[PDB]
Amino acid sequence: RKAKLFHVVPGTPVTPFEKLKEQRRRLPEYRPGNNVRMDPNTYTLYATKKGVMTIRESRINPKYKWLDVEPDIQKVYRSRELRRALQEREMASMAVGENSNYRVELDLLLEPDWRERVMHVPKATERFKDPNLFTRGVVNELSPLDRYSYT
C-alpha cells in the first residue's frame, strides 16, 4: 500500500493550494468541515480559505471527525498567545472546550439531553410533513431527507 497522511500540522495556518489530509477509501475518516473541500474520487481534503485548521470530533461517535479551516488567523493567534501566557501565570481556566479531556463534560452541562435527542426516531407523519404546510407557507422549507443527526 501507500501511506496517506496529513501534509500540514493541525492547528497551523494553511494556504488553499496545500492539501490537508489524504484519506483511504474504506463514510471517510475525515469529512469536509467549514471552508474545506473534498475531492470526491480521491477523498483528499483541500482548504477553501486561508486560515487555521482544527479538528472536530463527532459527539455521537468520537472516531468520525471533521477538518475545519477558520478564516481569520490573527484571532486564533492572539487568543492562543494570551491563553498560553495565562497558562504560565496560572491564571487560565482548564474548563474550555480546547481542553480535550473536558469536552465531554462541556457538551454534557450545556445540553444534558443530547443523548435522547439523537436516539429519538421520528415517525413518518412528522418526518414527511403534510406539504400543504409548505404550500400555504406555515413552514418555509420541506426537507424529508434529513432524518439523521450529525453533530
Next chain:
Amino acid sequence: ELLHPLPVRARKMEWLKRDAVEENEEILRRPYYTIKSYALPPAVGRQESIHNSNNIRGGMHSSHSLDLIMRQPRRVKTPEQLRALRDRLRFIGVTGPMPQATSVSTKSYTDTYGSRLRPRYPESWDTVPPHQPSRELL
C-alpha cells in the same frame, strides 16, 4: 551471552543509583519560591528538618560557615534601609548619563584617561587583570 551472575556489590551500587534518582525527584517536588520576611534569618522554615535529624546530629558539614551565615538575623531589616542603601549605590560601567549636578570638577576615570586606556596593572600569578579591553565591546 551473559553467563555468570552479577556480583552483590554491583547491584548494591545500582540500588544506590536508584535512591540517588529518588533524592533528585524530592528536590524537584519542592516549591518554586519561598515566602520570607525581612527581619528573620534566611533559614527559619526549611525542608531539611528530617535531613538534619538523620544526617546532621553532631557532625560538622562542609557547608558549615554558610549555614552560620544563614542562622543569624538578616542585616537589612526594613525596606526603607534597603532603598536608602540602594539609592547610594552607583553603576560605573553603565551606558548613558550619570547624575552630576552636585560637584562638577570631580572627574571620573573615563573623562580623565579616556575609554581606550586602562591603567597598567601589575601582572603576575595571583594578580591577573583582564587582557585586551577592545574585545569586550560587543
Next chain:
Amino acid sequence: RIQQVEGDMFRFEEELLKIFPTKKIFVRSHSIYVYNVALDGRMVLHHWLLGLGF
C-alpha cells in the same frame, strides 16, 4: 571585483566596510573583492562612486 582603484586602496576599503558591514572584503594589488554581493551592491558601488565625484 573592483579593479580600477588607484591610490590608497585601503581607504577605499575602509569606507567600503561602512557600505558593506556584513560582507567579506579582500585586498590585492590590482583589485578589491567584496563577497556575497550581487548586482545590488554593484548598483550601490556605482551610486557611491558617482556621488563621490568620480
Next chain:
Amino acid sequence: EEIEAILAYHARKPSELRVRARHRPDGSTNVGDDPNFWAQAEPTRMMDGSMLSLWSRRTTLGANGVPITYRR
C-alpha cells in the same frame, strides 16, 4: 483597480506565466513534480536581493508601489 488587474493579466503573453527557472522568486527550487509550481508570475532574479538585511524595505518597492519579490 481590479479591471486594471484583469486587463494586465489577460494582456500578457502565455510565456509570461510559465516557469522560467530552477528557482521560484522566493529562492525555493521548483522540482517539476508539483502542478502548483508550473506557473510563475514575476520573473526570478538570481543576481538581486543580497542587500536586503542591510537596507531599508522601501527599496523593495516596485514601480506601482507593490513590493517586488526578492530571493531570500
Next chain:
Amino acid sequence: LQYFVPYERDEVNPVVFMDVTVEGDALGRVSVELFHDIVPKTTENFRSLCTGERGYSQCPLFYKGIPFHRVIPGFIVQGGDILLKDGRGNVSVFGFPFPDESFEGKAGKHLRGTVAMAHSAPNQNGSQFFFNLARNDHLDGKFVVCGQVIDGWEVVDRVAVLSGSSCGTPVSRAWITECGQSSGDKLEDTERALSGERALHTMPGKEVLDILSPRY
C-alpha cells in the same frame, strides 16, 4: 510644572510617536520631533528603529515592546537596547555603532524638552535613547540631541514618578506598546512597504504586550 516645547518646530523634520505602558496601564502617546536638518544620520537611525522599516539584523530593529531599563526621577528616562534588553548592548541599523556626527548647535544643548542618544563610549552611538527630565548642563558636550518631545510630556514625567529610583533601576516596569512615524517626509512609501497581509516582524499578541509582558 509646565512643559514648554524648547525649540520652534520646523516642518522638514519627522514626527515619531511612542505609546508607553507602565505595568499594564497605558499612559498615552509620546510624539517626538527629530532634528533632521542639523542631525541627519542619528535622525534616520531613530526613525528606522521606531518604524520596523528594517528587518532582523542582530535583532528585530523595532522599539515595540522594549522596556525602559533605566529611569532616574528628575534626571532621565532611558530605553532602547533591542539586543539584550537589560541595557547591556547597542545596535544600530548601520550594522555597527555610529559616532556622533556633530554637536554643533541646537543639538548641543540638553534642555528639559529633549530626546537624546545614549552611548557607552564617546564614539559608539547605539539604539539607546534617553529623555532629559530637567535642564542638564553637564551633558552638553557629550551626548547627541536627537530631537524634542512635542506632545505627551505628562506620560514621560508620570513614567519618571511611578517607575523610578535614583539608583536608576526601575521600581515598576515601563515598556513601549507601539511606535511609528506619524508625519514628516518618506511617510507614504514607508507604510507601503509595511502594507500587505504578511507583516514584517513576529511579535507576541496585541494584548499580551499591553497588559502583562514587556517583550523579554
Next chain:
Amino acid sequence: YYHGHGGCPGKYGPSREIADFEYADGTPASISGRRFAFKHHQDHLLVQLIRAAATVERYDASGLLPRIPGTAEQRNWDPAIPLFLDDVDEQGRPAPLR
C-alpha cells in the same frame, strides 16, 4: 570534596591557585595561558550563577513562578505531589467528622 577540592588533588583546591614558585626576592611568577584560561573558567561559574539568579528574579517579578510545584509531566508521573484541586476533597466527597 569535603575539604574544598574537586575529587582530585589537581583541581579547585589550594594546589592550583597557589603559585608553584616565587623568586628569592619575592618577585612572583607570570600569567600562563592556562592560568588565564582557568581564571576565565572560574569567572564563568560566577557569570553563570548571576545570570541564573537574574532570570529567577525577573521571572518572579513578571510572576511566572507557579504556586504548583513541578511540571505536568512530573505531576502525572508521581503520586507524591498532592492534587492541587481547590474546592473539592481529593478523594471522592468529604470525609465524616464526628
Next chain:
Amino acid sequence: MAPELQLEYMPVLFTRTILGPQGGFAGEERLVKLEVARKYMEAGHAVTPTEELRRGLWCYNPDTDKYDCFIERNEEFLDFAARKRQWLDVYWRVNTGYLLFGRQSWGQGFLINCPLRKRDVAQKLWEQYKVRIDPRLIEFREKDRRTGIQELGHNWCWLYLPGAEELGINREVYDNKRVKVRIHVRKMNSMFALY
C-alpha cells in the same frame, strides 16, 4: 440515528446486578457500549432511562428470581450509588488493566538489579491507570516480601480495597477486599530504561 454514525455508547438503567466491567448493579444509570447495551436490554436486564424509571424501578432479588425488589431512587440512594460505583470503578480499572513495567537486568538468571517495592507499584498505577490509592494498602506475595519483586516477566501483587460492606458489594466482584494487580517486568537497555 444514521447507520454510519452510531452512538459510541448509550445510557442504560440496570435491573440485574451484573458482574463484568461493563455491567453495573441494580438501579444505577450508566452509559455503556452499543453492543453490550443491546444484549442487556433485549434480555430484559436493562431499560431505557425514562423519567418515571429514574424515580423508581422493579429490580430483582436472586432468591425469588422475579422482578419484585422495588427500589426508588431518592437522594440517599443516589449518593449510595455514587459511592458504590466509584468503588467498583477502581475495582474494574485495576484488574482489567495490566501495568506494563520496564527496567534493567544484569547477571545470569532473569533478575532485576533494582527490585520493586510498594512505593513504585502504586506509582505505575497513577502513571498509566490514573488510580490514586494509599500505597500501604498494597501487599506482596509471600515470595516477594523478603526481596521485593525483582524477577523478569509476569508477576502479580495484591491491592486491598478497604471499604465495602457499606455498599453491599458481594458476588458482583471476584472478592470483596482484593484486586490482583498484574505486573509485567521487561528488561531494557540503558537507552530506554531508568535506574
Next chain:
Amino acid sequence: ARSPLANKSPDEYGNTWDPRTGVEWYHRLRRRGAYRHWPWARWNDDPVRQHQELSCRRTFSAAVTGANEGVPLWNYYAEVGQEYGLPSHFPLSFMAPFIHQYTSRAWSRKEIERHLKVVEERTGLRTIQQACDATSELLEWGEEEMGVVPHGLLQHVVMLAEDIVLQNKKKAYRKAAHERGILRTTTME
C-alpha cells in the same frame, strides 16, 4: 525509516493518528528545495484585517473622535478562557480588570470602572448575575441613551458577564460531580 517516531518532537510521540513520516515531511522540516520557505501561510499575516486597526476616526465632530473604540472584533472571552475569581453575585464594578486588558489604549482601569458604576445607577442591573438575563434591557437602555457610556463597553459587558456566569455554572457542576464520584484533576483528566 518508516517508524512511527519519524520527524516528531518527543512531546508529540503520543499522537499516532498523525505520523510525520514520508520523504516530503523530511523536506518540509529540514526545509529543503521545494519547501525552502515552509508554511506559506504562517502566523503574523492576517487576510481579514491586513494588520490595520478598524477604528473610525472619521467622526463628523472632532470632539467625539474617540467615541467608538474598543468595539470588539470577536468574543475575546469565549476564546481565551481567563479564569475569573468572581462569583455571579458580585457588583459590575469588579468586571474591569478584565475589560481593561482588551480595552487598553482606549480607557483606563479606573475609567472603565466609573463607567460601569454609571451603568449600575442608570440601569437596574447591579449584580453580574443580573447582567446576563437582563442582557436585553442592558442593550436597549444602552442604545436609547447612546453616549452616557461608550457603546463599545456595552457589548463588552454583555459577553463578559455571560461568560462569568457560564464559568460559575461550570465550577458549580464540576464541584458537584466530585461528590457524585466523577473525580477529575486540575487538568480535567
Next chain:
Amino acid sequence: DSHKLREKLSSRKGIFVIDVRDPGERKLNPVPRSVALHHHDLLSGASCPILPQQKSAAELFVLASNESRGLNSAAALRRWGYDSVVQVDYNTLVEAGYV
C-alpha cells in the same frame, strides 16, 4: 462566638489569621489584619518560614469563603505540623469585632 470573641480580643496581639480566599472578594470584604495567602501557597510549603516557628504552641485561623477549601487548608496546615486550626468565615469575625 461566645468563646471565640475573648479569644481574639486582647488574649494576645495579632497577626493570627491566614485567609485563603479569592482575590476578588478579599477586596470586597477585606479583613485588614490577616495575611493573604493562597491555598496552593500553603499546601506547597512555600509559606513555612513566615508561619510561626513553634508548631505546638500556635493556633491559627483559616478564613475561607467556601468551606471546602477551609477543610483543604486545614489539612495543608497539619501536614506541616500545625494541629490547632480553627475555621472561620467572614460573618463570624464580624460579630467578634475583628473587622
Next chain:
Amino acid sequence: AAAIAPGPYRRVGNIFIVHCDDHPFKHSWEVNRMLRELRLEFKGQTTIVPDIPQVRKRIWRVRHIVKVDVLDLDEAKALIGVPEHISFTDLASQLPPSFGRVKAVPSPVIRSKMNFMKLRRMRLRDVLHRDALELRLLELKRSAMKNAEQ
C-alpha cells in the same frame, strides 16, 4: 512569639546546581538533547541553572543522570560575598555580553560570522575614530581659512 512574621514579605526563588554523573553516549538522543539544553556535554561537568518551570521540565527527564542541589537566592547571596542590599538583576546588568560563547546561534556558520562581526566592529571602531579626527581637523581648517580670508 507563636505568631506569623510581620510582613513586608519577599519572594525568594531557587537555583539548581546540576552535575552529570553518567556518559551521555549511553543514552538516547532525546535525553541527550535535554542534557544539551542543561549545558552538559560530558560526564563530570557541572552547571548552574535557574529554578523556572522549563528547567524542571528538563531536569525531570534526565534525573537518572544528573544529580541536583538547591540554593535559594539568600543562600546564593551568602555563597559569594554579596551585600544583601544588592540584587542579582543589577549584577547581571553590569557584566558584559561579550562573555565567551555568548549566544546559542543555530549553525556553526552563523557562529563563525558572529565572531567575524565581532572583529568587524573593532576595525570599524578604529577606522571611525581616525575618520572622526579627520572630520574635525577638516572643520578647523575650514573655519581657519574662512576667518583668515575674512
